Every structure is written in C-alpha cells, then in structure tokens.
C-alpha cells in the first residue's frame, strides 16, 4: 500500500517519457501529406501512423530496463505491439462528444468514415471505436495510462521474442508498480485495464489482416511509408 | 535500407 522509491522513479520516468513523445499541440501534423475527403485518406493516415511509430519507439527506449534487452527482442516487441500502442495512445485525442479523434481543426478531425478512405472496413473500425469509448470511460490517470502502454509493450507473448523470461520480469515489475498505484489512489480497475490489453490483441489481429490485403496492392502500398512497411510488414 | 533500435 506504499510505493517504493524505485517504483516512484519508474512512474516518473514513464510519465516524462510520454510527455517527450506526445505533443498535445499536434503541430507536426502540417508536415504530413494533406488529408483528402480512391483511398484519398491513405497518404495522410500513413504519415500519421509512421509519425506515431517514431514516437512509440522513442517512448519504448525510455521504459526502465527496456534498453537492457537484446536489440532483436526490442524490435520484436515493437513490431508486434506498435499498432496496439498507437490505438492505446490515440485515446488522448479521442472525444466522446463526437466519437472521433480531434487533433486540431476540422482538417485533422478523423472520423470513422475517414479511416474507411484509408482501406479499412467496419470489422476493424466498429470495435476500435468501442475500445476507445470503453477506455475513455475508465478516466485513467496519466500514470495509469502510461503504465498500461509500457505493460502492453513488454508483453512476452509476441512472435519473435527470444528472452521470454526477462521480458516477463520487466512486465511484472510494471504490473506491480501499477497495482500499487491503483491501490493507493482508488477505493476492479486493474482487471478492467488488463481486459483492455486483451481487446488490443483482437484489434491487432483484425488490422494486420486488413493491412496485409492493403499492402499487396501496388497502387496502395506505394502510398505507405518506409517505416510502416517495416513495422507492419511480413519480413523479419 | 528497425538500426531508428544507433
Ligand atoms: C496516431 C494517433 C492519433 C489517432 C489514431 C487513429 C485515428 C485515425 C485512424 C487510426 C490511425 C487507426 C487506423 C486503423 C490505422 C491504419 C494504419 C494503416 C492505414 C497503415 O493500416 C489506428 C489509430 C487511429 C492522433 C494522436 O492522438 C496521436 C496518436 O499517436
């Protein structure tokens, strides 16, 4: 029912790492290819995701103990979970009032129909919005939000992971840190957030399906970015 | 031509 100094520094490190890698102004969005409302939104949303992958990579490298894993394990964790961290970190820009991601003005307001114009269907998008709504209703503290992202990233049950025991140890430390934080700050919540990680596994599965079909169409794959082709690609 | 792992 108390946080140790080492647990406190882990929280401080993860929150500061998130502030370094998440810009609430969304001012870098003007450097993306402009949004257009076949697959007219694909250039903009590909630049958006590729930008976010860079931010997730930066956030991951500042998770305490992450840089001590082997480089191959760091990459395997990133490739398998990048889309889950992006969906998770996107909750900050999601809004319950209009059910969309608002990253500034109307140009950077991403409705469900916009992502339809990036090659995705309702099978992915309807559960994704439901995930955003259920996550938004939890009213997570910033400490809980960033701890959930770090826990999701350090899941050992990913393809290509070698040192499954060390990643398990790191994730357990973060789960312990998170469980002690929830105890102190709240009067249930831990189980719900762990359930959100199971939702992300399902969203990940559906996205990779729709991305794979998208990436094999040359007129569309040429609209992606080099980083998106690596992270979401099949080669390893 | 994942060295954004420096
Ligand atoms: C990125 C972030 C934000 C929105 C995330 C969104 C909204 C648009 C549609 C997205 C991008 C989903 C798409 C299904 C992903 C499709 C990517 C691709 C076309 C390559 O298959 C995933 C997350 C959704 C904005 C800001 O919160 C930063 C965050 O970091």
Ligand 1 mean position to A81 CA, how many Å? 14
Residue A217 contacts by C-beta under 8 Å, 6 or more apart in sequence?
none
Kindly state if the Cβ of A101 falls inside 6 Å of ligand 1. Answer: yes
Beta bridge partners of A95: A100
* Among chain A residues, CA nearest to B1: A226
Domain that holds residue A151: 1-236
Q: Which residue minimizes the CA distance to atom 5 of ligand 1?
A: A90
Which residue's CA is the nearest one to ligand 1's atom 24? Answer: A87
> In angstroms, rounded to a whole number, what is the distance separating the alpha carbons of residues A37 and A32?
15
At residue A141, φ and ψ (nearest 5 deg) are: -65, 160
Instruction: Give the total number of structural domains in chain A.
Output: 1
Solving technique: X-ray
Phi-psi region of A119 (alpha: psi -120 to 50; beta: other; left: phi over 0): left
* Element at A101 (helix H, strand E): strand A100-102
Report helix, strand or coil for A109.
Answer: strand
Q: Which of residues 91-110 of A touch B (CB under 8 A)?
A: none
What are φ and ψ of residue A49, in 5° steps?
A: -65, -45
Q: Which of A106, A80, A48, A86 is nearest to A223 (CA)?
A: A48
């Amino acid at each position: 029912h108390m946080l140790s100094d080492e647990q406190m520094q882990i929280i401080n490190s993860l929150v500061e790492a998130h502030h370094k890698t998440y810009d609430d102004s969304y001012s870098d969005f003007v450097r993306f290819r402009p949004p257009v409302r076949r697959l007219s939104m694909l250039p903009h949303l590909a630049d958006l995701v590729s930008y976010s992958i860079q931010k997730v990579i930066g956030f991951a490298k500042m998770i305490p103990g992450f840089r001590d894993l082997t480089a191959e394990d760091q990459i395997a964790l990133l490739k398998s979970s990048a889309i889950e961290i992006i969906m998770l970190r996107s909750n900050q820009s999601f809004s319950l009032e209009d059910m969309s991601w608002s990253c500034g003005g109307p140009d950077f307001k991403y409705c469900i129909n916009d992502v339809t114009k990036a090659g995705h269907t309702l099978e992915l998008l309807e559960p994704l919005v439901k995930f955003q709504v259920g996550l938004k209703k939890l009213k997570l503290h910033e400490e809980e939000h960033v701890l959930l992202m770090a826990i999701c990233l350090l899941s050992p049950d990913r393809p290509g992971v070698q040192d499954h025991v060390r990643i398990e140890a790191l994730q357990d430390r973060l789960c312990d840190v998170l469980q002690a934080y929830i105890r102190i700050q709240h009067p249930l919540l831990y189980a719900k957030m762990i359930q959100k990680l199971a939702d992300l596994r399902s969203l990940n599965e559906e996205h990779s399906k729709q991305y794979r079909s998208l990436s094999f169409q040359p007129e569309h794959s040429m609209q992606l970015t080099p980083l998106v082709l690596e992270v979401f690609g099949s080669e390893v | 031509x994942x060295x954004x792992x420096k």
